[PDB]
Swiss-Prot record:
Residues the record lists as binding substrate: 364-368
Keywords, alphabetical: Cytoplasm, Endonuclease, Exonuclease, Hydrolase, Metal-binding, Nuclease, RNA-binding, rRNA processing, Zinc
Name used for this protein in its record: Ribonuclease J 2
Residues of the full protein shown: 3 to 444 of 557
Gene behind the chain: rnj2
Domain of life, per lineage: Bacteria
UniProt similarity note: Belongs to the metallo-beta-lactamase superfamily. RNA-metabolizing metallo-beta-lactamase-like family. Bacterial RNase J subfamily.
Subunit structure of this chain's protein: Homodimer, may be a subunit of the RNA degradosome.
Binding sites annotated in the UniProt record for Zn(2+): 74, 76, 142, 164
């Protein structure tokens, strides 16, 4: 519900536009400022070495007095990766789901930041109140559980930020969408919608996750020897899928040494995963079992999951190496930037004499909605104004075209770069100002 009659609305992207951010979107209602997400970016191609890129928050610092909070949609590193670095320079309350807050806390622990932080755990029923506006939330479907959309209630209508999202008819736990809550927000009136454009260029729909799990099952069932599956640590659904399959094929699961990935292990201890007892075994205990009774999972982030298999195929891995008659499956989705290292690794896999489980080319796997899924969000929301984010310029354009198709006025669709300022007086929406933005390498 709306608290007061508002005057000024400003929307500023400091990350996540013209790039696969590294998400950070600043929303201002009158004298109050809100930051939606704070992601990092891994440097793209170029030269391999440096670890991370974060947004320039100089505009936020100059107006730190007005920052009422930081709102985090999900626990991925493109959403919460730069939070610690923001919290060093500014002190603001952090809002997120139960899992997201846990993952942020771990990030602060890992950087040995002992500074006290005000954490507020939110859910789809939470309604956070401020001087000028009320903020509500709704569940979204993503590769990680407890992802939320943010709804800022103003007199002009709702400012909605989707975060990264999808629409899958097979995911229905803490991955479930809030169709009712979304529909309500739409009917009460959405002033401006800020949505994910990552897969805006791909027509149609994502392949439903259950179809993917089924095809993995049928493929894994044929494996007579050892099986090694490569995954992103970010993709909890794919991880949950192989755990299900291993249980059904009476195999047991082992992660690469020497311990477990932090995000996975936090979510596991909070009960987000469905894991039978003694399904997981330590990597040192793998030799005790016959080759056909183990599934080894290689997880990573930057693109190592592929690199790890290269190190295994080429007898150079510090923990475990590939032996002839081993089976390999890539449970990932390949960026054009990683087409080359997959091709090289596959070759080395074949030279080691490993069986390559082929990826179904009819399958399109993504954490982000395709054209029709994005139009789905647009049809439910029915925004007056649209601001496509989370994509390169070509991706943003594609998302804009989708919006126009759903009935959003072309005049009211805005394509922006980092530092651009979208302002609303009460009559006209204008892009007339530009603030400090950029990339900070770390
Ligand atoms: Mn994500």
């Amino acid at each position: 519900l709306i608290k007061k009659k508002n005057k000024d609305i400003r929307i500023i992207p400091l990350g996540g536009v013209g790039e696969i951010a590294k998400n950070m979107y600043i929303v201002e209602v009158d004298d109050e400022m809100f930051m939606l997400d704070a992601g990092l970016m891994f440097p793209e191609d170029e030269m391999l070495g440096v670890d991370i890129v974060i947004p320039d928050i100089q505009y936020v610092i100059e107006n730190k007095e007005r920052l009422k909070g930081i709102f985090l949609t999900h626990g991925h590193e493109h959403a919460i990766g730069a939070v610690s670095y923001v919290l060093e320079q500014i002190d603001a309350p952090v809002y997120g789901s139960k899992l997201t807050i846990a993952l942020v806390k771990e990030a602060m622990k890992a950087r040995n930041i002992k500074k006290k932080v005000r954490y507020y755990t939110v859910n789809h029923d939470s309604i956070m109140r401020f001087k000028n506006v009320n903020v509500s939330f709704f569940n979204t479907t993503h590769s990680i559980p407890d992802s939320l959309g943010v709804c800022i209630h103003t007199s002009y209508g709702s400012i909605v930020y989707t975060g990264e999202f999808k629409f899958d008819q097979s995911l229905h736990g803490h991955y479930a969408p809030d169709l009712k809550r979304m529909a309500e927000i739409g009917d009460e009136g959405v002033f401006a919608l800020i949505s994910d454009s990552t897969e805006a260029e791909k027509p149609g729909y994502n392949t439903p996750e259950n179809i993917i799990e089924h095809h993995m099952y049928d493929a894994f069932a044929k494996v007579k020897g050892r099986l090694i599956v490569s995954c992103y640590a970010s993709n909890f659904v794919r991880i949950q899928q192989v755990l299900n399959i291993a249980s059904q094929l009476n195999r047991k699961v082992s992660f690469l040494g020497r311990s477990l990935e932090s995000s996975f292990n936090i979510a596991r201890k909070m009960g987000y995963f469905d894991i039978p007892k003694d399904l997981l075994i330590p990597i040192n205990e793998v030799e005790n079992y016959p080759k056909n009774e183990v599934i080894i999972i290689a997880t990573g982030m930057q693109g190592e999951p592929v690199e790890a298999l290269s190190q295994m195929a080429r007898k150079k891995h510090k923990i475990m190496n590939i032996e002839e008659g081993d089976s390999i499956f890539l449970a990932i989705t390949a960026s054009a930037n990683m087409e080359v290292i997959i091709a090289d690794t596959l070759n080395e896999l074949v030279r080691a004499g490993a069986h390559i489980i082929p990826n179904n080319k009819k399958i399109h796997a993504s954490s982000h909605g395709c054209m029709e899924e994005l139009k789905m969000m647009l049809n439910i929301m029915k925004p007056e104004y649209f601001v496509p984010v989370q994509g390169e310029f070509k991706m943003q354009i594609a998302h804009a075209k989708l919006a126009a198709e759903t009935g959003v006025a072309p005049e009211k669709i805005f394509l922006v770069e980092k530092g651009d300022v979208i302002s609303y007086n009460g009559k006209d929406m204008i892009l007339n100002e530009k603030v400090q933005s950029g990339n900070i390498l770390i």
